[PDB]
Design an enzyme around this catalytic site. Sequence first.
Site, short mmCIF file in Angstrom:
data_model
loop_
_atom_site.label_atom_id
_atom_site.label_comp_id
_atom_site.label_asym_id
_atom_site.label_seq_id
_atom_site.Cartn_x
_atom_site.Cartn_y
_atom_site.Cartn_z
N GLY A 288 0.85 -1.18 0.00
CA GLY A 288 0.00 0.00 0.00
C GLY A 288 0.88 1.22 0.00
N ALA B 75 0.88 3.93 1.81
CA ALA B 75 1.32 4.21 3.17
C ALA B 75 2.35 3.22 3.71
N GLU C 256 -1.05 1.51 -7.50
CA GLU C 256 -0.91 2.87 -7.96
C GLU C 256 0.57 3.12 -8.27
N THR D 125 -9.46 8.78 7.17
CA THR D 125 -9.40 9.45 5.88
C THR D 125 -10.48 8.93 4.95
N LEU E 288 12.96 -12.90 16.55
CA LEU E 288 11.60 -12.59 16.12
C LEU E 288 10.65 -13.65 16.64
N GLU F 43 11.00 -15.20 19.35
CA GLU F 43 10.87 -14.80 20.76
C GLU F 43 9.67 -13.91 21.02
N1 LIG Z 1 1.83 6.77 9.52
C1 LIG Z 1 1.43 6.89 8.28
N2 LIG Z 1 0.15 6.67 7.96
C2 LIG Z 1 -0.10 6.85 6.62
C3 LIG Z 1 0.80 7.24 5.62
N3 LIG Z 1 0.18 7.32 4.40
C4 LIG Z 1 -1.06 7.00 4.64
N4 LIG Z 1 -1.30 6.70 5.96
C5 LIG Z 1 -2.59 6.31 6.56
O1 LIG Z 1 -3.02 5.09 5.93
C6 LIG Z 1 -4.36 5.25 5.41
C7 LIG Z 1 -4.33 5.60 3.96
O2 LIG Z 1 -4.30 4.51 3.06
P1 LIG Z 1 -4.27 4.98 1.48
O3 LIG Z 1 -3.08 5.80 1.20
O4 LIG Z 1 -5.59 5.63 1.21
O5 LIG Z 1 -4.25 3.66 0.72
P2 LIG Z 1 -3.24 2.53 0.52
O6 LIG Z 1 -3.44 1.66 1.75
O7 LIG Z 1 -1.90 3.01 0.21
O8 LIG Z 1 -3.85 1.65 -0.74
P3 LIG Z 1 -4.99 2.16 -1.83
O9 LIG Z 1 -6.33 2.43 -1.14
O10 LIG Z 1 -5.33 1.10 -2.89
O11 LIG Z 1 -4.38 3.41 -2.42
C8 LIG Z 1 -4.96 6.42 6.17
O12 LIG Z 1 -5.54 5.97 7.37
C9 LIG Z 1 -3.74 7.31 6.38
O13 LIG Z 1 -3.94 8.12 7.54
C10 LIG Z 1 2.13 7.47 5.98
O14 LIG Z 1 3.04 7.80 5.23
N5 LIG Z 1 2.38 7.27 7.36
MG LIG Z 2 -2.07 4.16 -2.73
#
Ligand SMILES: Nc1nc2c(ncn2[C@@H]2O[C@H](COP(=O)(O)OP(=O)(O)OP(=O)(O)O)[C@@H](O)[C@H]2O)c(=O)[nH]1
Ligand SMILES: [Mg+2]
Lengths: 412, 426, 328
Positions: free
Chosen positions: A9, A11, A44, A152, A225, A227
């Site tokens: 993902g 994130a 993406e 979000t 791990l 552990e």
């Molecule tokens: N800590 C942290 N949380 C993040 C970050 N990017 C996104 N998030 C959180 O993760 C979620 C967002 O997921 P998305 O970016 O919408 O989606 P994705 O999981 O990458 O996958 P898709 O929906 O297919 O794009 C939200 O709850 C954000 O607050 C990051 O860089 N750091």
């Molecule tokens: Mg994404």
Amino acid sequence: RECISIHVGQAGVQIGNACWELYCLEHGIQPDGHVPRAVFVDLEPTVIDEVRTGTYRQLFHPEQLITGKEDAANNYARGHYTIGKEIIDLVLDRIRKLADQCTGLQGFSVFHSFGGGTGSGFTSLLMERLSVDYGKKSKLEFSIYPAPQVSTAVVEPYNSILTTHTTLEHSDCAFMVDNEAIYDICRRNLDIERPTYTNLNRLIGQIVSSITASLRFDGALNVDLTEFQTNLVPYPRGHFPLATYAPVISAEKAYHEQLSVAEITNACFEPANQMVKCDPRHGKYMACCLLYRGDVVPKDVNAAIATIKTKRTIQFVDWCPTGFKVGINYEPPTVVPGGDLAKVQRAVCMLSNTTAIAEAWARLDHKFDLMYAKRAFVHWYVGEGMEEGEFSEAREDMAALEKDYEEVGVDS
Amino acid sequence: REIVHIQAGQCGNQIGAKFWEVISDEHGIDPTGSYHGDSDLQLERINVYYNEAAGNKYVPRAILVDLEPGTMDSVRSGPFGQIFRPDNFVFGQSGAGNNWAKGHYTEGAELVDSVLDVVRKESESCDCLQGFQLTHSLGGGTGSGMGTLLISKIREEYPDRIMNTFSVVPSPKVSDTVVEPYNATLSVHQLVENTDETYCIDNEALYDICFRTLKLTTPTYGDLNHLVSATMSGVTTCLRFPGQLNADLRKLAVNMVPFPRLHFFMPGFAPLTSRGSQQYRALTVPELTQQMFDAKNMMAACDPRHGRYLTVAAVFRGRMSMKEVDEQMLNVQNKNSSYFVEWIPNNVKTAVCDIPPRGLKMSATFIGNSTAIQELFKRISEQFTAMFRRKAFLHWYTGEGMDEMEFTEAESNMNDLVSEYQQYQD
Amino acid sequence: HHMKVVVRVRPENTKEKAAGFHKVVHVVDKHILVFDPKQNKDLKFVFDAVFDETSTQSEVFEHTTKPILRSFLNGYNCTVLAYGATGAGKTHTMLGSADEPGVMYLTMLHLYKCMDEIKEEKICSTAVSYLEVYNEQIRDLLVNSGPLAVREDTQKGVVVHGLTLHQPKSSEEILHLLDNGNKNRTQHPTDMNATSSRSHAVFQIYLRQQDKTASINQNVRIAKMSLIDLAGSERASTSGAKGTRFVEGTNINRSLLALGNVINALADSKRKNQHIPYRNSKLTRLLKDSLGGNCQTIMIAAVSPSSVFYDDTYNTLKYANRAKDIKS
Ligand SMILES: Nc1nc2c(ncn2[C@@H]2O[C@H](COP(=O)(O)OP(=O)(O)OP(=O)(O)O)[C@@H](O)[C@H]2O)c(=O)[nH]1
Ligand SMILES: [Mg+2]
Ligand SMILES: CC(=O)O[C@H]1C(=O)[C@@]2(C)[C@H]([C@H](OC(=O)c3ccccc3)[C@]3(O)C[C@H](OC(=O)[C@H](O)[C@@H](NC(=O)c4ccccc4)c4ccccc4)C(C)=C1C3(C)C)[C@]1(OC(C)=O)CO[C@@H]1C[C@@H]2O
Ligand SMILES: Nc1nc2c(ncn2[C@@H]2O[C@H](COP(=O)(O)OP(=O)(O)O)[C@@H](O)[C@H]2O)c(=O)[nH]1
Ligand SMILES: [Zn+2]
């Protein structure tokens, strides 16, 4: 010995670039050194492209950077079933090509973001296909579960009740870091109303360094791990400890830095410091793996914990006499050259299973029902090769996770 | 990923010149020139709207559909008019009569196959298609009739790829045409059943938002269109940029349509300050959410204060804290818990690009799915019955091979569409 | 009034008996089955009636259909829905050969006597339609043509002016040939040979009643009885085919979602208003009159004791349970 990692993902890849940054930074391996030990998955292209364009560009093989030029979609179904399916084979092939090259590994540190499309859905089957191809290993998934009020995606709970039920029967230990309850640490314990995502990622990028990096590194009290899941999971549900760090002091403002063990350990159990909106509102700890690093005397710990074992307002579970895995490492932490992190000579990255997530799960489950009660965005998953079954039957799933995290505690 | 715009009718065309006037500068594309782009990022994603042929000539991948020569012959004879490959001009030198039936059944129905031909040449371009942008007015022949046909055919050829629609719903106070509700009720009918994202804009909601939110005393059409084209750039092209949290047409669709009708939104831009003076730079962020979520500033006619929201999508594009964004959205959700619907715990879809609108520091497109748009299809549907009862200018439709049951159909459909939207206001 | 829900468990075939897997459904009594597994929920569910494996085609027909005949005579719209997984029993219950006449032939034989009895008291005339639903298109089964243009009546109510129901029946023989054409006509994916699915489909009868003394003219009783063979959902993961099979399965599920929204809405609209969205699909639109006010309705959920039927049966029964359950 090793532990692969699969950052799924956008994130799970942004956090991935950050945890991956902190690594070389404390191992003296500049932009172009050795070779990583992980992969990156997303539906993406433009995001994994940020690892192909931005910093740490040539530290990766274009082979451990999987992309599906197609569509992400903030929906589980599509990302699990329909689309995310096409990529999985190719994905697996790397965690089977990278898993072969090594020497007697221990598992895969998965990085995903619970309430996403590629982070929920895809990983659900990735971890799925792993628990069968390597049931003989560790499956520690590091999640970024849904913010308690500051979500979000509109659907978030649909995506996160579905990643939990599908992964539950497949993970070994699921670390959890709440995105919002980190911002409180950036406001209260560091002072900044400018927290870029790039910062929360430095912070998980820190707690995580304490997990793999330094612990797979020699020390006075090493902790494999395996552990973890042994000393950390009381029961086969892929149980979800919480991550916490101690010296989260600001590298500019205050300066008491020299905060001997006796202090940094007490600073873990205060709820305002735990990267999780699961404030110990009642949740009895049931096992904690206090990972220390830096200059720490084993008596300072075997005393700083003894004081805590007798605070009683910290109430551990009944069926647990002692639930304190002391992990001591040598090398102190390693802060970003000029981010905002203090830079102490010792830290405590305590993680633990708490009956507290009886909350966090409840509050995230109730969410789901309110929309499912009206079908809301259901036509978005059904039209993506899912059914009334997988929702309703993954709801019933987590229902016995509200009862599980209730029965394993609250009772004697 | 990719899209292929569609300039149906004159209005949807006139706007095409403004949508492409903008986007191109938001992509450093001079008339026939290439990427002069002040940066290097306005190019890694252009493909969304262009094609590679020469090496300086990235041509806009749109369609220009019109039965009135003089129109496309004003768009092609002016500024950026010489960038479209001539193959894009699907003209119909026929009489472009102001009849929905004249552009949907009789005169447009011929020109369609010579359109679909090119909509396929452009879709089969390369890479992966996402969807099609559609611009038009619901108050004319070539707009509401022929442009609503173009989609009823597109949605049969690729029921996978999305369909954004930018409709110029008939403005209340004064109608710039007479049969207006006829051309309109008949196109909204097709819209509710083919496109899956609609952004309804009102020439007078714009005038207001352009004469009081811009002290602009002489708001020419070029201006209204310019403002509109400013939003449709913050929607699409924008999210085809990087971001801490990016989305794309699907995320926007898959977060914004709770129920398959398609639902119609109401776009709103962020920094909408008059030139010299008002350059207050009060754009920290609480000032953008202040902006976007007010009544006035909704390019729709209806006021959001008159009906709950189902979804919102603040598509920001300018470096900002994922805390002061994700935070502000909350207090906004709680100050107005009254109007925001409850069976969605988080109505709002925060989206965050990085690069802002070329010359600005920080903006944010707003895409509201409020139940308030009920009080517009009401309006349209009223004007219909009040004149349909007497069959007013109906002989211009039937005399073009239409049906007395066709008008009945559309009104009832789009009139039911009002009903449904209330099912969630309650 | 309420829609009636029943469940039918088929009997495991010989091949499955060889496997000797655990039974997922246990029928306690006429009213209630238990959902497994037993060393789970262990929630008992009470239906009105259970059809056993034992019931062939006499018993199934007579129970469900007979009370709809009484509502048929009223001339209120009656409807029967038949569901089933692949291998559920779908053909056996609804039909069988001429040898063991299931619901259809027994409606045809009994209701043919019904036409005789009714016709005597009031002159009756009947016709029947076989309509399809493939890729969200209605196709008459007796003639394949383009889908009927949809229009609405002035008040409301969706009609297809592609209404044909091509040819009526004087007796059994003609309809029997049509049934051969029925299976062919439905558009199926190239499935396994054993399995065959419709796209989506239905069947209708038309009642127009006139007293003997009354003409044609004067008050008429208008009933319609619709007998529905719903298609099955697809799974993306199970299918793997996707593509055209994917699109057809998405279209089925969207029609199924709209129907289910009406269904749950119907129970709520026992305390309800217009809210029930008939418009959501072409099926529900066709059914506007028939799901109906005080119309009689029955749902026949077919399921098997089979192992694969485990998932499918459980899912359908949960949903069938939701029709009885859902209250505000
Ligand atoms: N800590 C942290 N949380 C993040 C970050 N990017 C996104 N998030 C959180 O993760 C979620 C967002 O997921 P998305 O970016 O919408 O989606 P994705 O999981 O990458 O996958 P898709 O929906 O297919 O794009 C939200 O709850 C954000 O607050 C990051 O860089 N750091
Ligand atoms: Mg994404
Ligand atoms: C010196 C300076 O800073 O000038 C600004 C300016 O004064 C203001 C008033 C601009 C100005 O916009 C208007 O006056 C306007 C005219 C007709 C319709 C709508 C708006 C500006 O013309 C518009 C222009 O916008 C852009 O450059 C964006 O990239 C924008 N571009 C266009 O709309 C565009 C215009 C002409 C040709 C090609 C493109 C954009 C916005 C969203 C998505 C893509 C592009 C900007 C910042 C300014 C001027 C130049 C005075 C404002 O508008 C926008 C869209 O930014 C009006 O309120 C804002 C606040 C700005 O500060
Ligand atoms: N915003 C906007 N509206 C326009 C423009 N041109 C015509 N319109 C609107 O479109 C309606 C008339 O339809 P028109 O575009 O002439 O139809 P067509 O040309 O026969 O397809 C009126 O409501 C006008 O206000 C324009 O350039 N910008
Ligand atoms: Zn000090």
